[PDB]
Design a protein around this ligand. Structure first.
Ligand SMILES: *O[C@](O)(C(=O)N[C@@H](Cc1ccc(OP(=O)(O)O)cc1)C(=O)O)[C@H](CC=C)NC(=O)[C@H](CC1CCCCC1)NC(=O)[C@@H](NC(=O)[C@H](CC(C)C)NC(=O)c1cnccn1)[C@@H](C)CC
Ligand SMILES: [Zn+2]
Ligand SMILES: [Zn+2]
Lengths: 186, 22, 17, 154
């Protein structure tokens, strides 16, 4: 968010059984808050980020699926199979992040555990961890945001470079790839 | 086949605060 | 004497359900 | 539920702060000294006492969680007060930092032993004393995390 240091917390709203029933009915009456949403399909659990009034995540996780809302299942707004992107209209009550304009290379990744990991940009869609971590830690964090020192969105977490069970580098989808998915079509 | 569901949230906007109650 | 804790501060800004 | 990283501590005399980094609650020697912390099971002895670096440490109490030390080397620091206000600070050395907005001395009083965070929210150091000229503070003085990390390897 706007200025100050990036700090985060996590709140669980549903259990395994509660998730399964609302996945099949597609009806979710629960109240929504925050910028980042912890998503699930029962079988797999990951992350979703709100940038520009739209809730984005990875295609390798959600596919061509619908999101559960208070009015029933909501169809996707954007689907970009090649850039590994998916988008639905941001749920009522969620806050959106503004794309980065400062061009900084000191990125900060937010995990599902609500921890903030320091990342250094090493390319257009590549960055390296300042402290190498085990692969288990990064699991469930796909679709999560990479923030700049101001707390603005640089990109969404896609894949980790794993050698022996430890990850030294991360792979992401940059914010400019989102805006060209908005300007494209199908 | 089934829908994607929201099982939780993460808020970035939380500013430092004193924990309420005694 | 001892050092007592008179309050706590959360950095994350977590409200408590 | 809900654990704090920063504790608001008090002696019979003054009132200051205490920050949990790596399973241990740290604060300034000029506030606690060789004192013990109160717990429902009795007084707890200090795990570390470094009189030279103005450091004191006891094991982390109940209702607390630890801050991870900074690994990004950023110079854009942020001070957290006893009132929970965040002050932007620029690093001007190993243990020195300047305020972007010069505040009166009262504003910083009792915020000693508090943390100085980097943009990731990770701990860079502990607020020790404020640099005062005429009653207004323009800069701050701190104990960096690498001093805490060596005092542990001992
Ligand atoms: O998607 C995630 O962000 C995530 O957290 N996912 C959840 C839920 C989940 C979703 C999809 C799957 O896929 P399935 O198993 O095939 O049905 C499983 C689970 C989770 O619990 O993980 C994570 C982020 C990583 C921790 N995503 C992954 O698991 C990705 C998968 C995608 C698939 C599309 C193409 C990109 C990768 N897996 C990895 O990132 C994987 N490592 C790699 O594939 C890297 C990719 C490079 C492009 C960086 N390759 C190497 O590390 C490598 C090393 N040495 C030689 C060659 N290649 C890791 C999980 C390690 C196996
Ligand atoms: Zn920016
Ligand atoms: Zn850092």
């Amino acid at each position: 968010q706007m200025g100050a240091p990036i700090t985060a917390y996590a709140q669980q709203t549903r259990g395994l059984l509660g998730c399964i029933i609302t996945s099949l009915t597609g009806r979710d009456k629960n109240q929504v808050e925050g910028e980042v949403q912890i998503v699930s399909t029962a079988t797999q659990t990951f992350l979703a980020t709100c940038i520009n009034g739209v809730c984005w995540t990875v295609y390798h996780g959600a596919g061509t699926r619908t999101i559960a809302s208070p009015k029933g299942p909501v169809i996707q707004m954007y689907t970009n199979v090649d850039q590994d992107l998916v988008g639905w209209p941001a749920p009522q009550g969620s806050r959106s992040l503004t794309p980065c304009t400062c061009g900084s290379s000191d990125l900060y990744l937010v995990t599902r555990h609500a921890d903030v990991i320091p990342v250094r940009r090493r390319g257009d869609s590549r960055g390296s961890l300042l402290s190498p971590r085990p692969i288990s830690y990064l699991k469930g964090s796909s679709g999560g945001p990479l923030l700049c020192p101001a707390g603005h969105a640089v990109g969404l977490f896609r894949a980790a470079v794993c050698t022996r069970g430890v990850t030294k580098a991360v792979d992401f989808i940059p914010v400019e790839n989102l805006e060209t998915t908005m300007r494209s079509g199908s | 086949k089934g829908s994607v569901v929201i099982v939780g949230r993460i808020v970035l906007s939380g500013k430092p605060a004193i924990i309420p109650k005694k």
